[PDB]
Design a protein around this ligand. Structure first.
Ligand SMILES: *[C@@H]1O[C@H](CO)[C@@H](O[C@@H]2O[C@H](CO)[C@@H](O[C@@H]3O[C@H](CO[C@H]4O[C@H](CO[C@H]5O[C@H](CO)[C@@H](O)[C@H](O)[C@@H]5O[C@H]5O[C@H](CO)[C@@H](O)[C@H](O)[C@@H]5O)[C@@H](O)[C@H](O[C@H]5O[C@H](CO)[C@@H](O)[C@H](O)[C@@H]5O)[C@@H]4O)[C@@H](O)[C@H](O[C@H]4O[C@H](CO)[C@@H](O)[C@H](O)[C@@H]4O[C@@H]4O[C@H](CO)[C@@H](O)[C@H](O)[C@@H]4O[C@@H]4O[C@H](CO)[C@@H](O)[C@H](O)[C@@H]4O)[C@@H]3O)[C@H](O)[C@H]2NC(C)=O)[C@H](O)[C@H]1NC(C)=O
Ligand SMILES: CCCCCCCC/C=C/CCCCCCCC(=O)O[C@H](COC(=O)CCCCCCCCCCCCCCC)COP(=O)(O)OC[C@@H](O)CO
Ligand SMILES: *[C@@H]1O[C@H](CO)[C@@H](O[C@@H]2O[C@H](CO)[C@@H](O)[C@H](O)[C@H]2NC(C)=O)[C@H](O)[C@H]1NC(C)=O
Ligand SMILES: *[C@@H]1O[C@H](CO)[C@@H](O[C@@H]2O[C@H](CO)[C@@H](O)[C@H](O)[C@H]2NC(C)=O)[C@H](O)[C@H]1NC(C)=O
Lengths: 338, 123, 333, 334, 338, 333
């Protein structure tokens, strides 16, 4: 009975409707109201310098050709309708291969208010890029952005404005945090203008501030290196006669230091610069190499002055721990404050 | 110690239902096949039914459409509903569980065997 | 005969508007869900997700699809589902899901004379659940599956479990290699977003991990290495080089296990149950190497007193490690 | 209202299966390229990733219209209704266009018939690397593209004046390598089906020694320096020289395998392997020379004393001579 | 007019043909005859409890709506014609992610005879679940199934059957065996019934029986452990005064077993119970650990009751090798008779 | 002018039945094929497959596509291939293949006045070959690519290489880091299945592995460990701890190296040529340490015998190992 009332209205809107022309072509500038709802901040990958995010990407503009008067003020049509009317060609500037979910139906929304205003939302999985300065690894902070804008329409045709205030146009879900070793301090929302050879385009930005957490690397990387250095210095509490006993200490710890150094680097891309972790590993490797040198001095200086050889070894029992204890307080105070 | 204990059965007169159950113990038979074997007096041991993890019900070429096998995976047991019993159905009914290697209809493929239950049908 | 059935089905789709839900502009359409879980596999701690395969059933009534004179349940070809209105049900916490398409697209449409529609899919999904690994591996998890309508609010669609607590079947036939399913639950509620209030159904399992695997892999390898250090206390120190040069190798061996145990689990900034035990066993084998160096340092100065320490090392070390296992297992169980 | 009438007339009687001037003259195409980034250069698979905006321009008499407007800034919905050249990248292992949230495509038609067509691509181009000089190697990874079915008599490509543009070079995902410059050439390739015009762009690259040198050269330099200490220790201290001799030789057995862990399974000796093997011969010979020295103390102890003095002379000299040969032959000679 | 004759026939068949209805709807049961040609039995992924297989899945039914009287008798048509007619919606119950190859064209075959009998084959790659009981690992055997049937039609509408005798209705190509560590001993072909929340369905089941080849585990796992056990028992023959020597023997070998015990977990899938390999490793761990214990007892009695110490050392040269010999015979005879 | 071309092309497609092969119900249609190999890469022994990229081209004559008055080889757009008849060629041993789609679908259609059709594709296929690693890493593999029609028997379609042995080009421009293509061969035959006899074209290579990498990463480390165990021969019985330590280090290292290398290949159940070396080199170090036990045992009773055995081991062991390499390197290479 009343079902066919809405059928005529929809066919009325789509009769003589051209989806190749933006609304208000040649008369004004189409404005698109945009806002985001982050359902889950996905994992951040250091090797590829990229991160994942799932959003309820909502867009809202106005088309005068879709006006209607009827019993219902708002129409909530099927996702199929979205492919027969003009929609903004928004794309992500720094986006790698992304996914638009299709289970069990195209995750799209389309509502047509009585005045012609449209609401068009979709559920995405955006995999954007991010520049990482790994100099301060693993005590680094980052600002991974998310830039999106039009592709074919210049700023004289389509302009993007946030639906609400910029501090409230992007909402992070309260339970939506899949980060493991990062902390989301906050996000910054800004809008700008980009210019290419084809003209000027509007670009909407969204910076996410991330701070790495050092709980994992302290127990898995630093502590194994620290104790290995300590085990090396136990070579100073052995009698000189038992040479093979001190022989095993030199080879084993150096072999251990090589293993820890290699495995730690497997967790990062082969950047040219040296990360802050490398300096601690290099210094630790320097000490375990310096300890094995001291053993050679013991034998070399024994024939010259046995007492001085005893003096050299006894001072080594004190000199080495003092240098390492002071060095750590230099290292840890250097990075945490900055 | 895995024991397959069987209950039910008895004597019925030329028809009528007679439900036979088999409760396992000592092991989870969710991933195994639980089957029923009938050994007629003096003839041989015969295959009746089976049901794997996917609830796929196999039946012998003879008792098909008469007996119903059903498993209660939560309680780790397999039943067998006997309907329209004929006088030549009198035998000892066995309960088995195995992985069905070299065929699930073969008596040699079942490691665990029940102790047998007596069913007698009189005219 | 068969031509008449073709005419009846053809008439229903003549004038049918797929863009409009049933009872458009009126009461909301009720939709009932049935899930038949086929298998659960790959409960990954590193990625913090799991794979689920199921037969997803949806029940709703469309008055536009009611026929008379045919006392049957028309099971039409699965391609006819492209000419009908179906709910836009999606899974919120899903990462990558697909419908199997061999040998054809696994899908079912089954009409009824009163207009009822049964619509089935075979879906394999990789839904994400966050895991609290503080008590790993002596931990329990609660992995869920969120079912929701995308474009329709509670004014247009309403979800309900079909059959109450018997809507989801097949959980008890699942054998996870490492976990064991303890309990599953069904929840129905509403969620309010910026665009309205949407119905939501939830399915959750409470997995509990099995400890028997980590005994052969983590605890027993760690315990035996600790016992080896104690054997050094019954050996005379005349082997001056041997005891120190082998205590160091035991400590080295302990770290090797730790290296290949951080590969098993993701990167998290806290200490799990497995880390406390390894750290605890590391200390005991670390003290033993430190203990001998003290003895070997004064092996000649006071050999009578040095030999006295090893007498107590034969008792203090084995007793203390028994205390550590007493506290550890009581606290974590 | 009026713009729709223009579009309908353009596509009325228009066949997209025929290139413009099919039986008259070749279709001349002007191509640009804007490079957002050059992704990681995977040496194991000998490939690299590039993300570009690809632009093409050509004329079409069938797309002439008279109106007060001058350019129709349409969108991707018109791409499938007009003739588009079938440009493909010859050395592409795997490439794909971008579709979120819509097909990332452009189309602008002027009133004289000129057509502009821009799309965004990510390409895993194939680059053959000569890793003889690793880590001091240099490379020129190319990117070639041409038509597929249209020979040189039907479609001719041509660069524009602004050949290739790049963004912020230092912000690209190149970690190991450092960008140098680009050179764009043109060539004609003859195949079994016809002669095709091929356009090429070469991205010159150079690996950085700022990480490999500290990682491997210095640890392999300390071992050789340290292994000479045995020659300053008298042979009476047998445990002293035995421990030192067995240490460095066994230590070099560690870094020997890890050097190639940064390389694929290349069957030719690279620069790193040559440095490692030579750094193993010095330490191995010093231990061996000590064994030869100690084996003739029982026979000619006076003669054996001569060899120790020579060891401190020739062995340090040989390492210095070798290093001069090694570094000059690669850094400035290759 | 060599082809227009057949064009009239094809246009005559599809005229008034509705492909949404199975043949004989509401009058009888549509009967499908099936047979498989395994071109290659692919690898078995033990760590996922699955396997792969490539088949020529062949089906055949009868539709009286497609009768004709033409110059020929069999129409070998394009794969496109398949989508114009009704075909069974066969699917695999335990498949995980299958592939229907369509390179360079949809690998499908359709043939129509003059009585309406249809033949419809396709090329598939199937990844099917195979539950595995690894208690007897690495001397285990398996029966990996492959179940297929209709998805939407109950057994009152569509019933499946085998084309020939069931044993000869599934054929394996001679050279298709891609297996590496297993050995296909043969298959059994059976038919069953399933009941779900929607009705009863006919299920056609094929079981493939595999036996693992233990040759790989003899060289990587079993041989090193045996050599380690024999290596430790060398320590008995050393004279008692080589206290540093035997101590190195005892400690190092037990460390080697722990290395081997962990190294066996890589190829071993994660399961709750203990495989047959772990019993061999556990016992071989006790033997080497007992050898270290025995030496300490002998060393303890030295300088106190040396005659007793030498008395025990003679026995350990006998009991340890003989008991290890007895243990091997039981272990290698218990598991080879299963 | 151009309108004449459009008129002619549209006339061909009018009344063109794509459901019938050329000369349906007549003599079989002949198809000629050329392959222009672009690259071969990722010859994986773990997956037993190789990846290939090629310019697959096909040839055939359709009398329905003939035209007159236009002395030009029309090169229609690649979308017209969906309206014409093309052979249903497939690769039997393929596992995962695709046609490149940048910037469009890589496909060519060219029509000749007599009705000849040239059809071209750019395919990146991952074919399957089973490798026999009984001589690894000194093996010689033979990986092929089976080309066959699917739905048409030898009564319908006939295959033949076009241009004879010149049908495959670009083989000489293939560089593989591990292998080196020695020879390629082209075969044409008929294959019989239960549904009939089908034409088949077979293309096969013959890859010979390069040993250059394995010398510096598999053998050279193994020789040095064996060489080092000979050092303990020159060290006298007095340093019992050092001789045992040197012996036990290599034996563990030989075990340490042996397991690590094998985890890079599938679990094939036989002894590869590399394994015989490592198993062979394990005996020499094991015999090196086992010899010392014999030396130590009779050292107390007969010091004279102990000195001689150590001296004779200094030459006998290196002499026999050189013999082992002489036999090994000649039996395989
Ligand atoms: C073997 O079998 C396999 C399948 O098992 C087969 O692969 C499939 O092959 C078919 C073709 O046979 C492919 O279908 C085409 O796909 C084209 C786009 O491909 C990209 O997008 C794919 C997904 O598309 C959806 O999502 C994107 C966004 O991601 C969106 O832009 C699309 O519109 C579409 O949206 C639907 O789905 C989303 C959810 O995903 C919903 O949200 C949405 O509501 C909607 O339902 C994606 O899968 C592709 O990736 C695959 O392929 C790439 C290589 O290309 C590979 O690298 C990947 O790994 C992956 O495999 C890819 O990203 C699409 O453009 C085609 O549609 C064209 O053309 C057809 C045919 O001519 C025509 O009918 C259409 O109308 C349309 O014409 C164009 O379209 C233009 C773009 O929109 C438009 O500007 C034009 O105007 C015109 O549109 C209309 O034109 C008419 C006439 O002029 C006009 O009247 C109208 O007004 C209008 O303008 C076509 O759909 C399919 O994608 C392949 N799938 C896969 C997985 O490969 C394989 O080919 C088989 N092999 C062989 C040998 O047979
Ligand atoms: C670092 C390492 C160093 C190692 C150094 C080694 C030095 C010595 C050299 C050894 C050479 C070994 C080479 C590999 C041999 C592989 C044999 C093999 O695969 O046998 C199988 C079958 O095996 C068997 O029956 C026997 C199983 C193993 C038995 C081992 C016995 C060990 C006894 C130790 C006694 C120690 C006493 C010490 C006393 C004081 C063949 O049948 P498929 O087809 O594989 O079986 C699949 C089925 O489906 C078929 O039906
Ligand atoms: C069509 O499906 C309906 C729903 O399953 C069937 O109705 C069932 O009929 C059985 C037998 O009388 C009852 O036990 C159930 O309670 C009914 N269910 C419902 C929801 O009414 C109906 O019988 C089917 N029609 C045919 C011809 O099979
Ligand atoms: C890229 O191609 C352009 C176009 O051919 C080159 O520009 C030409 O350069 C030559 C000299 O090499 C001049 O004689 C022409 O006048 C230039 N044409 C222009 C500017 O339109 C450009 O040099 C090429 N880039 C290289 C070679 O790096």
């Amino acid at each position: 009975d009343n079902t066919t009332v809405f059928t005529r209205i929809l066919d009325r809107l789509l009769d003589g409707y051209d989806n190749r022309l933006r609304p208000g072509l040649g008369e004004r500038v189409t404005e698109v109201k945009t806002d985001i709802f982050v359902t889950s901040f996905g994992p951040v990958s250091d090797h590829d310098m990229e991160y994942t995010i799932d959003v309820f990407f909502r867009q809202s503009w106005k088309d005068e050709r879709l006006k209607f008067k009827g019993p219902m003020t708002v129409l909530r049509l099927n996702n199929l309708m979205a492919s027969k009317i003009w929609t903004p060609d928004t794309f992500f500037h720094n986006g790698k291969k992304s996914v638009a979910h299709n289970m069990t139906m195209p995750n799209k929304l389309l509502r047509i208010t009585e005045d012609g205003t449209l609401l068009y939302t979709m559920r995405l999985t955006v995999r954007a890029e991010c520049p990482m300065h790994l100099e301060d690894f693993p005590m680094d902070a980052h600002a991974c952005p998310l830039k999106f804008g039009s592709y074919a329409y210049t700023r004289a045709e389509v302009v993007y404005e946030w639906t609400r205030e910029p501090a409230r146009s992007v909402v992070v879900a309260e339970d939506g945090s899949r980060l493991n070793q990062y902390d989301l301090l906050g996000q910054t929302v800004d809008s700008g203008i980009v210019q290419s050879s084809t003209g000027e385009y509007v670009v909407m930005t969204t910076h996410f501030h991330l701070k790495r957490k050092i709980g994992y690397f302290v127990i898995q990387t630093y502590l194994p290196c620290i104790m290995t250095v300590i085990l090396s210095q136990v070579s100073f509490w052995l009698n000189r006669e038992s040479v093979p006993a001190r022989t095993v200490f030199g080879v084993t710890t150096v072999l251990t230091m090589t293993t820890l150094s290699i495995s730690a680097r497997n967790s990062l891309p082969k950047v040219a610069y040296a990360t802050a972790m490398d300096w601690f590993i290099a210094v630790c490797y320097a000490f375990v190499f310096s300890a094995l040198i001291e053993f050679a001095t013991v034998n070399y200086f024994t024939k010259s002055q046995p007492a001085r050889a005893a003096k050299i070894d006894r001072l080594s029992r004190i000199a080495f721990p003092l240098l390492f204890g002071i060095f750590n307080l230099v290292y840890w105070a250097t990075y945490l404050n900055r | 110690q895995v024991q397959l204990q069987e209950s039910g059965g008895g004597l019925v007169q030329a028809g009528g239902s007679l439900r036979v159950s088999c409760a396992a113990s000592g092991r989870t038979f969710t991933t195994y096949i639980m089957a029923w074997f009938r050994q007629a007096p003096g003839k041989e041991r015969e295959f009746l039914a089976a049901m794997d993890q996917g609830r796929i019900q196999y039946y012998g070429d003879s008792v098909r459409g008469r007996f119903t096998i059903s498993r209660d995976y939560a309680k780790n047991s397999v039943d067998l509903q006997l309907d329209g019993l004929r006088p030549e159905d009198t035998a000892v009914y066995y309960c088995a569980a195995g992985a069905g290697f070299w065929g699930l209809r073969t008596a040699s493929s079942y490691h665990y065997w029940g102790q047998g239950t007596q069913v007698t049908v009189s005219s | 005969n068969m031509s008449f059935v073709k005419e009846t089905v053809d008439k229903l789709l003549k004038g049918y508007d797929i863009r409009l839900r049933p009872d458009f502009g009126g009461p909301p359409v009720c939709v009932g869900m049935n899930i038949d879980i086929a298998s659960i596999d790959m409960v990954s701690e590193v990625n913090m997700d799991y794979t689920l395969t199921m037969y997803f059933q949806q029940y709703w009534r469309d008055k536009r699809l009611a026929y008379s004179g045919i006392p049957l349940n028309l099971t039409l070809d699965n391609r006819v589902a492209d000419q009908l209105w179906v709910p836009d049900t999606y899974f919120l916490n899903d990462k990558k899901s697909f419908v199997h398409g061999v040998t054809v697209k696994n899908r079912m449409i089954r009409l009824h004379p009163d207009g009822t529609v049964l619509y089935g899919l075979r879906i394999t999904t990789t839904a994400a659940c966050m895991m609290d690994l503080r008590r790993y591996p002596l931990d329990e998890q609660n992995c869920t599956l969120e079912i929701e309508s995308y474009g329709y609010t509670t004014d247009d669609i309403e979800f309900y479990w079909r059959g109450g607590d018997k809507a989801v079947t097949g959980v008890e036939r699942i054998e996870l290699p490492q976990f064991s399913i303890v309990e599953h639950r069904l929840v129905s509620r509403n969620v309010v977003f910026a665009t309205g209030a949407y119905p939501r159904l939830s399915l959750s399992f409470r997995l509990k991990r099995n400890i028997g695997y980590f005994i052969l892999q983590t605890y027993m390898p760690s315990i035996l290495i600790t016992i080896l250090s104690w054997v050094s206390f019954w050996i005379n120190y005349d082997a001056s080089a041997a005891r120190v040069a082998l205590g160091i190798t035991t400590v080295l061996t302990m770290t090797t296990i730790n290296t290949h145990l951080r590969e098993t689990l993701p990167k998290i900034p806290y200490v799990k149950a497995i880390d406390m035990y390894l750290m605890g066993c590391f200390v005991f084998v670390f003290l033993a190497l430190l203990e001998y160096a003290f003895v070997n340092y004064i092996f000649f100065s006071q050999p009578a007193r040095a030999a006295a320490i090893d007498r107590w090392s034969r008792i203090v070390f084995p007793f203390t490690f028994s205390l550590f296992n007493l506290v550890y297992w009581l606290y974590y169980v | 209202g009026d713009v729709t009438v223009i579009l309908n007339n353009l596509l009325e009687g228009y066949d997209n299966k025929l290139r413009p001037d099919i039986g008259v003259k070749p279709t001349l195409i002007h191509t640009d390229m804007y490079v957002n980034s050059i992704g990681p250069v995977n040496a194991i698979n000998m490939e690299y990733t590039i993300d570009i905006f690809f632009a093409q321009t050509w004329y079409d008499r069938r797309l002439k219209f008279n109106s007060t407007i001058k350019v129709l800034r349409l969108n991707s919905n018109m791409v499938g209704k007009i003739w588009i050249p079938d440009t493909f990248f010859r050395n592409s292992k795997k490439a794909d266009a971008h579709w979120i949230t819509t097909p990332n495509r452009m189309l602008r038609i002027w009133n004289d018939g000129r057509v502009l067509y821009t799309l965004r691509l990510t390409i895993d181009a194939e680059c053959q690397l000569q890793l003889h000089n690793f880590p001091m190697d240099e490379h020129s990874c190319p990117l070639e593209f041409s038509s597929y079915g249209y020979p040189r008599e039907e479609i001719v490509y041509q660069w524009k004046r602004s050949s290739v543009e790049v963004g912020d070079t230092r912000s690209w995902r190149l970690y190991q390598f450092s960008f140098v410059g680009l050179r764009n050439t043109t060539e004609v390739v003859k195949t079994t089906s016809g002669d095709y015009v091929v356009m090429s762009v070469y991205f010159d690259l150079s690996r950085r020694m700022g990480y490999f040198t500290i990682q491997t050269y210095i640890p392999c330099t300390l071992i050789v320096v340290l292994s000479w200490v045995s020659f300053w220790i008298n042979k009476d201290a047998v445990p002293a020289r035995t421990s030192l001799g067995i240490t460095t030789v066994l230590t070099m057995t560690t870094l020997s395998t890890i050097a190639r862990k940064s390389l694929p399974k290349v069957s030719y000796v690279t620069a790193m392997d040559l440095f490692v093997s030579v750094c193993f011969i010095f330490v191995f010979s010093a231990l061996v020379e000590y064994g030869t020295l100690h084996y003739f103390v029982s026979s000619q102890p006076a003669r054996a004393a001569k060899m120790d003095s020579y060891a401190r002379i020739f062995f340090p000299t040989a390492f210095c001579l070798f290093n001069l040969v090694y570094w000059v032959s690669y850094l400035y000679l290759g």
